[PDB]
Amino acid sequence: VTPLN
Amino acid sequence: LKWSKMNLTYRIVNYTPDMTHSEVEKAFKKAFKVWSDVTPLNFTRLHDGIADIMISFGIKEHGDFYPFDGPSGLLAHAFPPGPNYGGDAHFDDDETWTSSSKGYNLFLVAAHEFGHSLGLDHSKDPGALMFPIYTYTHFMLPDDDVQGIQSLYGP
Ligand SMILES: CNC(=O)[C@H](NC(=O)c1ccc(-c2ccc(CSc3nc4c(c(=O)[nH]3)CCC4)cc2)o1)C(C)C
Numbered sequence: 001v002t003p004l005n
Numbered sequence: 006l007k008w009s010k011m012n013l014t015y016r017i018v019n020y021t022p023d024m025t026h027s028e029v030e031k032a033f034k035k036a037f038k039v040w041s042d043v044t045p046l047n048f049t050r051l052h053d054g055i056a057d058i059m060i061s062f063g064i065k066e067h068g069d070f071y072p073f074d075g076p077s078g079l080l081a082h083a084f085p086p087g088p089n090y091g092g093d094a095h096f097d098d099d100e101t102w103t104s105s106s107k108g109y110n111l112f113l114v115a116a117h118e119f120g121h122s123l124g125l126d127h128s129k130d131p132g133a134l135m136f137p138i139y140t141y142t143h144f145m146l147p148d149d150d151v152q153g154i155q156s157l158y159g160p
Pocket residue numbers: 005078079080081082113114117118132133134135136137138139140141142145146147
């Protein structure tokens with residue numbers, strides 16, 4: 001899962 | 006994505022050079038209180054072992070293969086609710102973290118990151134805490150953010 005900035 | 010429990014833990018794994026431990030702790034506590042004040046969520050701090058929300062400061066490649074980019078640009082990132090990296094929040098220490106109008110205000114960025122940690126995406130409302138672009142204007146959680154977090158967890 002790609003983290004959000 | 007959403008936590009299926011209301012009582013969450015966090016751990017401050019390490020600290021920025023930029024601020025005292027006490028000021029970092031104060032900023033993160035205030036940032037969690039933003040969300041606990043308008044939901045049934047509760048947050049407790051742990052000093053060892055595994056917490057739901059693991060918080061750390063790092064630069065460039067720092068362990069998760071989502072690297073930071075040096076000074077400017079990316080500030081921080083957080084993973085949506087889930088096991089392992091889920092919920093965790095990482096801050097780019099190539100930025101200067103403050104409790105002022107200078108550099109980047111750690112409380113404001115942390116409150117935004119913990120929004121992601123709890124399952125919020127970005128807002129299109131330019132005044133929202135969860136707007137994607139950082140600006141620095143007594144803090145009051147904007148109404149879009151109240152609406153968004155209560156949709157997941159209720160009041
Ligand atoms: C892909 N993103 C980026 O590269 C950078 N952004 C980030 O990396 C990042 C990480 C976290 C945030 C972020 C944090 C807080 C805000 C809201 S700032 C803010 N929010 C509010 C107030 C205020 O004074 N300031 C008063 C009420 C709500 C926005 C973005 O931005 C930036 C160059 C756009």
